């Protein structure tokens with residue numbers, strides 16, 4: 663799949679694809 | 693179906709940029 | 723012409739995410 | 753042009769633009 | 783309004799790739 | 813906002829959003 | 843007011859976008 | 865079955881996308 | 887250990903990102 | 909000749925794009 | 931100190947990127 | 953030396969990426 667680090671805007675795009683119709687929550691605090 | 697899934701990828705990419713530390717939820721419909 | 727070239731950029735970006743190690747070919751038409 | 757490293761999803765977008773109608777093959781194995 | 787703002791994000795992303803060292807101006811209308 | 817480094821194509825996308833209808837100039841020379 | 847509604851037919855500014863931040 | 869056909873008018877899931885992996 | 891420490895500072899599979907879907 | 913005009917209805921090649929470089 | 935040294939090699943806020951808008 | 957070692961671990965011009973077009 664992606665045996666890889668996903669940071670910044672690449673993480674939120676991964677979430678966007680993976681989650682689909684559901685949606686997601688991004689919290690870059692910790 | 694698409695070019696709205698197309699637009700949504702630009703949104704969470706814009707929201708990552710706009711929101712940063714605060715973070716964000718992405719809730720389609722609702 | 724465009725917004726199908728627009729959609730295709732989202733595909734190989736999704737395919738990079740989805741496929742990873744396996745890799746992928748991108749063959750329009752065909 | 754891009755006297756620069758192109759990794760991850762930036763490499764597949766470079767290929768996508770450069771190759772055009774032809775298409776490309778991405779293999780991140782080695 | 784959108785999917786032309788959608789296309790424009792793909793342009794400056796293509797122009798960053800295409801132009802590199804030379805750089806580029808992005809002037810809508812004009 | 814983005815208390816974060818923005819390099820390469822992420823910088824030109826930040827400019828693209830932030831500047832809006834105005835437009836921008838990218839010079840990666842120095 | 844929904845996201846896809848008034849940012850995917852209309853263009854949301856950085857200030858309209860910011861309505862959607864936590 | 866083509867790529868641009870049923871992922872650029874329809875929305876392909878992560879599982880529909882995976883039909884296109886090596 | 888948080889989304890960035892689990893995925894950005896680390897590596898997460900499909901079922902370590904599916905934890906943050908709504 | 910404008911940018912959005914002949915790259916957002918037509919598809920600009922890497923060589924058409926290069927008309928817009930400094 | 932230039933766009934990349936001010937923003938890429940450094941950190942710039944909204945009002946350190948607004949310097950490069952037309 | 954492979955696409956990533958030629959372009960990601962290294963630097964490739966237009967005519968070092970054109971090697972991977974169909």
Ligand SMILES: [Zn+2]
Nearest residue numbers: 698702728788
């Ligand atoms: Zn797009």
Ligand SMILES: [Zn+2]
Nearest residue numbers: 670672762822
């Ligand atoms: Zn990146």
